[PDB]
Every structure is written in C-alpha cells, then in structure tokens.
C-alpha cells in the first residue's frame, strides 16, 4: 500500500530501506522522502519503521 502518496512510498519500500541498513526513522526519511511534503503520513510511516526495526 501507499503510506505516502506525496512521495510514492509504499510500506514495502519502507521495510526494504530497513532491511538494506537504515537504522532510524530519520534515515528512512532521508532514503525515501516519506513524510517530507504534506507530513500527514508521518505517524503511519514511523509505526512501520519501529515495528520493522524490532523484527530485525
Ligand atoms: S502523504 Fe506523505 S508527505 Fe504527504
């Protein structure tokens, strides 16, 4: 699904960024742009990031 329409970021792309080495929400945002435009998706993006980091 699209977490972030403004930047075309899907949930699987967020997970990809983490499995590829991103270790924080800030890094996922820098890698993908998630949440940087209107900001409205940030809470959902943060949830995906934290759950995926805990599952490494
Ligand atoms: S939906 Fe993600 S920044 Fe607008």
Asked if 33 and 7 touch (Cβ cutoff 8 Å), the reply is: yes
**Residue-range domain boundaries for the chain:** 1-56
- The rounded Å distance from CA 39 to ligand 1 centre is 5
Q: Is 4 helix (H, G, I), strand (E, B) or coil?
A: strand
The reported resolution of this PDB entry, expressed in Å, is 1.2
Q: Does 8 sit in the ligand 1 pocket, CB within 6 Å?
A: no
Angstrom distances, CA of residue 20 to CA of 17, 37, 38, 53, 56: 5, 24, 26, 11, 11
Out of 1.10.10.1100, 3.40.50.1000, 3.30.365.10, 1.10.150.20, the CATH code matching 1-56 is 1.10.10.1100
- The rounded Å distance from CA 11 to ligand 1 centre is 13
Experimental method: X-ray
Q: Does 23 sit in the ligand 1 pocket, CB within 6 Å?
A: no
In the chain, what is the straight-line distance between the N-terminal and C-terminal CA atoms, in Å?
21
Partners of 4 in the β-ladder: 9
Residue 11, Cβ neighbours under 10 Å: how many?
17
């Amino acid at each position: 699904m699209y977490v972030c329409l403004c930047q075309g970021v899907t949930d699987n792309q967020i997970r990809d960024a983490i499995y590829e080495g991103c270790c924080s929400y800030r890094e996922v945002r820098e890698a993908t742009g998630v949440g940087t435009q209107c900001g409205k998706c940030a809470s959902l993006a943060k949830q995906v990031v934290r759950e995926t980091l805990n599952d490494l």
